[PDB]
C-alpha cells in the first residue's frame, strides 16, 4: 500500500520484464487478486524468470526477487510460493523456494493452499511450463 513500496515494486517489476524479453522468456499472470496485482505480478514474474533464466543469469533475477521480497516484507505478513518446474529446471525452482522461505518462513498451510492453485493451473499448463502460485496476507 505505501506509495514508496508500489514505486519500488513497479520498478523491480519493470526490470523483471526487461530481463524476461532480453532472455526471451514469456510470463503470463493467469490470475491475481486485483487488490494485490502488482505485488503478486512481481513475485510471479521474478519467480518464473528465475526458474527459466540461464544459470549464469539467474543470480541477477534471484537478486531482483530478493529485493522485491524485502520491500514486500513491509506490506506482506507472510508469503507462500508453490512451483512446478520441468526436470531440467528443478534446482532453479528450489533456489526460489529457499529465497522466499528465508524472507518469509513458508509454513505448511499456506504452502499447500498455494500448491492447490498451482495444481489448478497445472491442469491447463503445458508439460514444459513453469507454474508459480503465490499466496500473501497483507499487513
Amino acid at each position: 500500500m505505501p506509495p514508496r513500496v508500489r514505486r519500488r515494486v513497479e520498478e523491480l517489476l519493470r526490470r523483471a520484464r526487461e530481463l524476461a524479453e532480453e532472455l526471451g522468456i514469456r510470463v503470463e499472470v493467469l490470475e491475481v487478486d486485483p487488490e494485490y496485482e502488482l505485488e503478486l505480478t512481481a513475485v510471479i514474474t521474478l519467480a518464473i524468470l528465475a526458474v527459466l533464466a540461464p544459470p549464469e543469469r539467474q543470480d541477477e533475477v534471484l537478486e531482483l526477487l530478493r529485493e522485491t521480497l524485502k520491500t514486500l516484507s513491509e506490506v506482506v505478513e507472510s508469503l507462500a510460493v508453490s512451483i512446478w518446474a520441468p526436470p531440467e529446471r528443478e534446482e532453479a525452482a528450489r533456489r526460489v523456494e529457499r529465497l522466499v522461505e528465508e524472507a518469509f518462513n513458508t509454513t505448511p498451510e499456506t504452502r499447500e493452499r498455494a500448491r492447490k492453485l498451482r495444481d489448478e493451473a497445472r491442469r491447463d499448463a503445458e508439460p514444459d511450463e513453469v507454474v508459480v502460485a503465490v499466496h500473501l496476507v497483507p499487513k
Binding site: 510470463v27 492453485l117 511450463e129
Partner: peptide, 11 residues
C-alpha cells in the same frame, strides 16, 4: 483471496 498464479515458458 491474496492468491495469484502465473506460468512461464522458456525460449
Amino acid at each position: 483471496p491474496g492468491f495469484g498464479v502465473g506460468r512461464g515458458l522458456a525460449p
